[PDB]
Design a protein around this ligand. Structure first.
Ligand SMILES: Cc1cc(C)n2nc(CC(=O)N3c4nc5ccccc5n4C[C@@H]3C)nc2n1
Ligand SMILES: [Mg+2]
Ligand SMILES: [Zn+2]
Length: 324
């Protein structure tokens, strides 16, 4: 039930080289993958190679892997291929700027997990599938989509000629898969609030210890979250755009509820469009800013994300006060 790429696709990938002019910009946090759709898979490989060295993975098995992932993203307005790459990029920037805080095994795991984190998203929220009464919530009933996303990854990983991790030891294999699982589950926004509070705590009392694996997992998790929301960290006109994308889904979900004579929350109601800027404000203020603030504290080199967030915040304020 997994979908595979054709030899044409993956072989195309292998032959791609990145234009020299992007080499610089790719290293920047606010870098936008938007205007380079064909290059997306190629851009992932590049990031893999630079982070983890050129022969970290048998290039052949890697390219098949990436194109198959692509094919299992659906054609929805936001939780799509583009999202997966954008998020994976953001993690690349994070890893790059903290290069020795993490292991080869973490960096392989995390870029992979990012690319895989929303695999086979249907544009329906966790709340929806549970609240009426999908076969998926009938299988995992906390963090529904996220457990599916991980299962999907594993399925793709177990496909013929696709196993990029094959040449690890079986102990290392079972570790990276662990890393990944925790990383993906962490993107359930429900878990983030608990997780950031815990971190907030540990940092403030100076009991945060990157040698303690449990702490490691929470710092990783926060990263995953930071990466997931990173649209808010692009330059205003990019962010503005990405917003319409996230809303299109929300309102498609809202519509599907209205069809069962159920009133959607205002966020998912396209008849409540003018409330949007305000909603951003709220989201930036209760979610985004706290996310990046805590990340910047733990990982000072990730400060530019926070800075870009704040700039977008005040653009939303300017929109509300009516100056855009
Ligand atoms: C990446 C990402 C992920 C998520 C879940 N959101 N959610 C938001 C917006 C949001 O949370 N709000 C929001 N917008 C609204 C728009 C209209 C009406 C009510 C609205 N409300 C209520 C609430 C304050 N922006 C996000 N961006
Ligand atoms: Mg998700
Ligand atoms: Zn996501």
């Amino acid at each position: 039930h997994m979908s595979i790429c054709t030899s044409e696709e993956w072989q195309g990938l292998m032959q791609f080289t990145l234009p020299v002019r992007l080499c610089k910009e790719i290293e920047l946090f606010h870098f936008d993958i938007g205007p380079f759709e064909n290059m997306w898979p190629g851009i992932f490989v590049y990031m893999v190679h630079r982070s983890c060295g050129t022969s970290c993975f048998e290039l052949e098995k890697l390219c098949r892997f990436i194109m198959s992932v692509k094919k299992n993203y659906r054609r929805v307005p936001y939780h799509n291929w583009k999202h997966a790459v954008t998020v994976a990029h953001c993690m690349y920037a994070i890893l790059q700027n903290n290069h020795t805080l993490f292991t080869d095994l973490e960096r392989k795991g995390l870029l992979i997990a990012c690319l895989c984190h929303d695999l086979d998203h249907r544009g329906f929220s966790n709340s929806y599938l549970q609240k009426f009464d999908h076969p998926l919530a009938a299988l995992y009933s906390t963090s529904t989509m996220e457990q599916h996303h991980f299962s999907q990854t594993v399925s793709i990983l177990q496909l013929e000629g696709h196993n990029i991790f094959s040449t690890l030891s079986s102990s290392e294999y079972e570790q990276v898969l662990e890393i990944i699982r925790k990383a993906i589950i962490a993107t359930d926004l429900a878990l983030y609030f608990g997780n950031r509070k815990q971190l907030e705590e540990m940092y403030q009392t100076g009991s945060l210890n990157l040698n303690n694996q449990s702490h490691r997992d929470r710092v990783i998790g926060l990263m995953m979250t930071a990466c997931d929301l990173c649209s808010v960290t692009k330059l205003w006109p990019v962010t503005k755009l990405t917003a319409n994308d996230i809303y299109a889904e929300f309102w498609a979900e809202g519509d599907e509820m209205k069809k069962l004579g159920i009133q959607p929350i205002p966020m998912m109601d396209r008849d409540k469009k003018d409330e949007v800027p305000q909603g951003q404000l709220g989201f930036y203020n209760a979610v985004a800013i706290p996310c990046y603030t805590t990340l910047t504290q733990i990982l000072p080199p990730t400060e530019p994300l926070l800075k870009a967030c704040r700039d977008n915040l005040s653009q939303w304020e300017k929109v509300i006060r009516g100056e855009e």
